[PDB]
Amino acid sequence: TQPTFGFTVNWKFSESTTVFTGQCFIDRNGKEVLKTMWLLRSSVNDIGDDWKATRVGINIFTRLKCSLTGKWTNDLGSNMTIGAVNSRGEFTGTYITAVTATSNEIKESPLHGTQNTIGSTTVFTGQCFIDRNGKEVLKTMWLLRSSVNDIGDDWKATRVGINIFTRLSARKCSLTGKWTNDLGSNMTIGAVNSRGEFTGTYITAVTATSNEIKESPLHGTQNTINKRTQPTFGFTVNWKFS
């Protein structure tokens, strides 16, 4: 049972973010395959258009325990490079998409993700809006990837839903702070560095497994193309004891 992972692609040629989540399998004749689902979050101008901002699909990655480190290609012809995976399961890499949903010239983009140390993964993606009352809101969608024991159960490993987060001059919408969502969960996000990267912790008020879930770490980025006041973002929660 190779672990689950998620990652965020911080696109450098548009204001969008993609999150990918899934699981590596050593099935076919010793070959490794990443089975993933993604959410592509587009930047919208107002919260009223939020409902149409999120696309969904799959990618199967093959090479160019089931190490993520290395170079991979997917079914759409995209390539990604993933470097060393640290002890906390953290990894960074670069992605070159072969295809785009926006009318911009493609640029190689960074990715940051985490693999489940020893278990499930959730990736969230959305946009940080300043509401009419000046409060920040995160409107997000997520994919919750469960571990399966054979590739034949991969089809049923991914749940989807939404979360709205609110914080516990309102010029730029910033991810830093302590947040609660509509399910009762809480997260804290640290400073967002110049590369748009941020770290935090997450305590979910709800579970889909019968394990004890502890406070779990999160790593993500915020998109900085055209330096928007309402940036898209993505993050991966690496569930602990899950």
Add this chain to the structure above:
Amino acid sequence: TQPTFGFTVNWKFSESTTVFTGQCFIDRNGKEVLKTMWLLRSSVNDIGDDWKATRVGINIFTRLKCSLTGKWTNDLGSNMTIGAVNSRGEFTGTYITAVTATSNEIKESPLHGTQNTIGSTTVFTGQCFIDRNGKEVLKTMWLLRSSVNDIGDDWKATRVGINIFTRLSARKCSLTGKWTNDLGSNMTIGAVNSRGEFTGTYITAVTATSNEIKESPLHGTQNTINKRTQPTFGFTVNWKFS
């Protein structure tokens, strides 16, 4: 435990299809609420663009056992009317969306769906392509809605994934025939009438419950706006013994 349902909205002002799936709850002070997730399938010109054709989100419907019959409004301001639900759980209705992803003037559109008689529901949406070799392929995405026992578990009730179907002069892509997908499942679809409606049966090769699933009925529509050779479509599988 109010049952699960799914339905297909056959849009009349664009070449798209939306499927909705979810569950009615009598929570708040006797009030009924439909918790649903949807996939919006856009029409693309070639199979190479299929990957970006599908959007995802939620809607909560409230009124304008948990009967679907009646008039409902959702959180985006859309209205739908659902008429009588028959003994097989089949229903039809009309939908007026308040919002659009295409640059066309909005028109009231038919919907056709099914509620689970006594259990889960799957909705599929996709596009019927003629491949380069002239074979038909259905590229689809689905949401599998499970029944939960309280609204508090609604967040975890929906799985997402894909299926590719192939058939067991190639001018127009037609849904009629016997199909298999990449999981081993089989479906048969009857004639597609002038309104784009069709009926069929589905035998899944795989399950996410520990019940015995029998052959289960399906009802859907194909989109006929600009009479495309590669129409989008949606259908609901009303799982039996599930």
